[PDB]
Design a binder for this molecule. Structure first.
Ligand SMILES: *[C]C1=C([C])[C]=C2C(=[C]1)N([C][C]([O])[C]([O])[C]([O])[C]OP([O])(=O)OP([O])(=O)O[C][C]1O[C](N3[C]=NC4=C3N=[C]N=C4[N])[C]([O])[C]1[O])C1=NC(=O)[N]C(=O)C1=N2C#C[C][N][C]1[C][C]C2=C1[C]=[C][C]=[C]2
Ligand SMILES: *[C]C1=C([C])[C]=C2C(=[C]1)N([C][C]([O])[C]([O])[C]([O])[C]OP([O])(=O)OP([O])(=O)O[C][C]1O[C](N3[C]=NC4=C3N=[C]N=C4[N])[C]([O])[C]1[O])C1=NC(=O)[N]C(=O)[C@@]13=N2C3#C[C][N][C]1[C][C]C2=C1[C]=[C][C]=[C]2
Lengths: 494, 499
């Protein structure tokens, strides 16, 4: 019935918010809509797989908040397998390689690729992480889609295809679907193009021993019976002295403050009294999530390592169900598996199939790309279609279509009276990742702390010490990369 | 507690659905979230204004369903004043004219304007009204915004600037916010560019004597206490023998079937058991409504008629709060007023102002454009900002961004078990209008009737006899209009005759 702060949602952001408030002696209640905590993280357990991450899973250098939080909960990381060669599959042939970027040999193409990533990053530097709507050319950039920008920038089909894959892989949306300004912000606020794409030395380096879902689970363990499962919030009343929150089962909670720790658009599932301010009212109808099926095929052995492949595959073209894969074998070398994503529109198309039909396409595919009959002999299969999730809306995160970010961006984490906003969407570093989920939950927690005079203003946003277990090497560019002309730069010079 | 059909929402669509079901002896309940019926229609009454439509209001030729429905309810129409000259205000000057299109003299500009509207309509003909994702070039047209298309098509700033206002005016969104395919569909499904834009002989011709809100109010009168106000639906359970609907106040209804008659995106306010099928799950996060403030300034007289202006103004350029206006005087010639819309991003920006600050800007604006100091002397002011409405989400209707429509369009009116879908967004003729709202409610009603074996499949979609009070002239094109080259067509013809 009564407490200091009601937290709506038990994902990493909610749980992190609850923890920080509870470690300050406050009385918190987490209202979670599902019969489990974790949200967009979800670790499944059975005999066959032991455990498997079916949502959020990967963490890496510069992601210091999730690393710290998880360590404090007694969790450990291991490195994702990247010892042997990666494969780029393009126009139906596999080209093995090392390093993080696939090499390109043709001189003109080389220049077009070099200049594209470099322009991605150049544009990023003019975009403030904590207010992108304040980039100098924000309207110009917000009013075009990432496809218009690709058509403009890429003088070769090679470079344009790879850049489309990247966009698809990062935001589980089509380049036609998103704003150039939002996506350029997104990449920027994760440290730029190198940092975001890398396995070794970028966001894909590591996973958690036992499952990322143990982050939320263990916090729910720490909070005891303060966490209420199967409590979907349906009403929020801020007209009286205290905030009143009603859940679907008819329970009623009272607090001094509320934290909304759910995807922005899911605020649509709550009725408000008084009505939300006009900007936020319309903002929450204009901000959808990506579309992705996460798919994990199991094998007797990690057969690919025999051929000196690591399990990473970058797979070009429309016919391929899966554009990207990683080795999902346990650190001990057993439960051998390949993880792959079915992205954006392909997630919509391939959902019409049965589970067993998708398993077939993915093995046929992996057989082609790996050049192994062994790939046609799977022992087990798990998959998750996040588009069907009522209390997610999609995965991995929220994207902004044309025109929206500059109009409604500001509103995202603006408090509405006594409601404060967390969720990975409201983060300013690694937004859309687990890392950003911790950042935004701890910040909203400290906003309420401050509103209660417990801390000064300067302490609301707080920096994080570099992990000692997963330290970060800095991003470096060679002299030519930085200075070689673009294709039109080379034409102007000719 | 129990009935045949629960209808969520008592807007024109819900009310028309309810009426058709109840006229077949079925037991219906309308669950309306607000303390009033009419939703996006809303007639305000007071001494100062008598009445005023603050939401939907206009009807005209080819809109036979609303015309019939309202007539049966004992309502009458009158013609919006269009007797004297219209004004096109561009680059700070007013250029009076007659006949629904502002004329253009410059022959190069004239060619670009001609070819733009004509191309709008040409592209229309390739898009099916009832399945626009089936256009031959659907993906290509759906993956680009309306502003990419205008950059491509318009060889003059003159034509591009007017075409932007047209889009802003029709869909209360920016050109860069919407799909080229969706917008082309939208215009097409209203009869094409002429039909849509016209006051005389197009959708803006008339209003209802007394207010459009009387349509829903009178249906509520006819239905008695079946209409339940302040019942926002929060829950729908379809796991058992009957459908269970729970409202926010904790009431519970049981029916054999449900009709959702609320903006598509507003289905997000309902919790579903079992979960929605995946396409519809995500469809509803992907389809937002426009942004408009509807504004009516009142004067002692309709002073503009004295100067031989009818009250219509097409006002170009970024400094103007209002891009379009219409004479709102009562048909008796009293309660003299001007109606104007603040569109799209202008509605966001000018909401930060106070009610009295916006009245100033509009008056100053009207004064420049009418060249009248009397414009600066208002007697009364009423405005509605529909962006702030929780149970609308915007006005006038729902728009589809780049890539959505071909991916999620099919889903819009697909039943989910025993839930059937109405509301104007689901209509295939005049979608976005009060007309579309009637079309889609009567169709959903008949869907349920058919599911109950009461009517054959062929009776689900039904045509409508032409109104005799508001008959429709057909749309005609001159020989040059149809055949003159475009700017690039004229360049290729100059190129061919030398090189
Ligand atoms: C889904 C997904 C997947 C499949 C994958 C991924 C992901 C996802 N990610 C993301 C994550 O997961 C996220 O971000 C997080 O988790 C977030 O969180 P938050 O914010 O907290 O939220 P959530 O979780 O959702 O939760 C919330 C809650 O709430 C609730 N609710 C609702 N509503 C309601 C409620 N309650 C009450 N009431 C009401 N009404 C719900 O239920 C929930 O629970 C990720 N992340 C990271 O970090 N990592 C990873 O890995 C991930 N994943 C992935 C990623 C990928 N990456 C990639 C690879 C390759 C590449 C990339 C990128 C870039 C480049 C390259
Ligand atoms: C808002 C507006 C404005 C300002 C204007 C306009 C409009 C609007 N419009 C549109 C109309 O209004 C619409 O469409 C109708 O009304 C529809 O309806 P429906 O379908 O039925 O829907 P609604 O209304 O919304 O209703 C529903 C209901 O539901 C409810 N809910 C929610 N949620 C819930 C509920 N319940 C329970 N539960 C829950 N959960 C609500 O509350 C409601 O009630 C229009 N239309 C027409 O026809 N006309 C007119 O006039 C109108 N307006 C305008 C127009 C304009 N036009 C223009 C001028 C010039 C031009 C144009 C266009 C083009 C060219 C040129």
């Amino acid at each position: 019935n009564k407490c200091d702060v009601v937290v709506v949602g038990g994902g990493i952001s909610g749980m992190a918010a609850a923890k920080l408030l509870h470690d300050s002696g406050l009385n918190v209640v987490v209202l979670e809509a599902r019969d489990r905590v974790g949200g967009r993280t979800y670790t499944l357990r059975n005999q066959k797989v032991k455990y498997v991450d079916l949502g959020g899973s990967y963490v890496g250098p510069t992601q210091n908040r999730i690393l710290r939080l998880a360590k404090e909960l007694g969790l450990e990381t291991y490195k994702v397998n990247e010892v042997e060669r990666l494969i780029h599959h393009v126009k139906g042939k596999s080209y093995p390689f090392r390093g993080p970027f696939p090499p390109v040999w043709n001189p003109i193409t080389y220049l077009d690729h070099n200049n594209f990533w470099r322009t991605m990053d150049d544009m990023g530097r003019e975009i403030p992480s904590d207010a992108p709507w304040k980039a100098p050319l924000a309207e110009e950039w917000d009013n075009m889609t990432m496809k218009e920008l690709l058509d403009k920038l890429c003088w070769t089909e090679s470079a344009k295809q790879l850049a489309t894959l990247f966009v698809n892989l990062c935001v589980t949306a089509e380049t036609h679907e998103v704003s150039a300004l939002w996506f350029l912000w997104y990449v920027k606020q994760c440290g730029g193009t190198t940092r975001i794409i890398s396995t070794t030395n970028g966001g894909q380096e590591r996973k958690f021993v036992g499952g990322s879902g143990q982050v939320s689970e263990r916090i729910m363990d720490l909070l005891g019976d303060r966490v209420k499962l199967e409590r979907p919030v349906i009403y929020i009343d801020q007209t009286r002295e205290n905030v009143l929150v009603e859940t679907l089962n008819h329970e009623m909670y009272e607090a001094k403050y509320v934290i909304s720790a759910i995807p922005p658009t899911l605020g649509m599932k709550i009725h408000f009294n008084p009505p939300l301010p006009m900007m936020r009212n319309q903002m929450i109808t204009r901000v959808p999530l990506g579309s992705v099926i996460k798919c994990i095929v199991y094998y007797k052995e990690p057969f690919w390592r025999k051929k000196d492949y690591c399990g990473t595959m970058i797979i070009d073209g429309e016919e391929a169900p899966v554009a990207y894969t990683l080795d999902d074998t346990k650190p001990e070398g057993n439960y051998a598996a390949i993880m792959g994503f079915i992205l954006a529109h392909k997630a919509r198309k391939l959902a019409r199939l049965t589970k067993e039909e998708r398993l077939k396409k993915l093995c046929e595919l992996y057989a082609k790309v790996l050049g192994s009959l062994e790939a046609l002999e799977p022992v087990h299969y798990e998959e998750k279609n996040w588009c069907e999730e009522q209390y997610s809306g999609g995965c991995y995160t929220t994207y902004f279509p044309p025109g929206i970010l500059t109009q409604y961006g500001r509103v995202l984490r603006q408090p509405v009276d006594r409601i404060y906003f967390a969720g990975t969407e409201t983060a300013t570093h690694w937004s859309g990742f687990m890392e950003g989920a911790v950042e935004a939950g701890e910040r909203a927690a400290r906003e309420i702390l401050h509103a209660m005079g417990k801390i000064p203003e300067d302490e609301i946003w707080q920096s994080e010490p570099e992990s000692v277990d997963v330290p970060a090497q800095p991003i470096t560019t060679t002299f030519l990369e930085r200075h070689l002309p673009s294709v039109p730069g080379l034409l102007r010079l000719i």
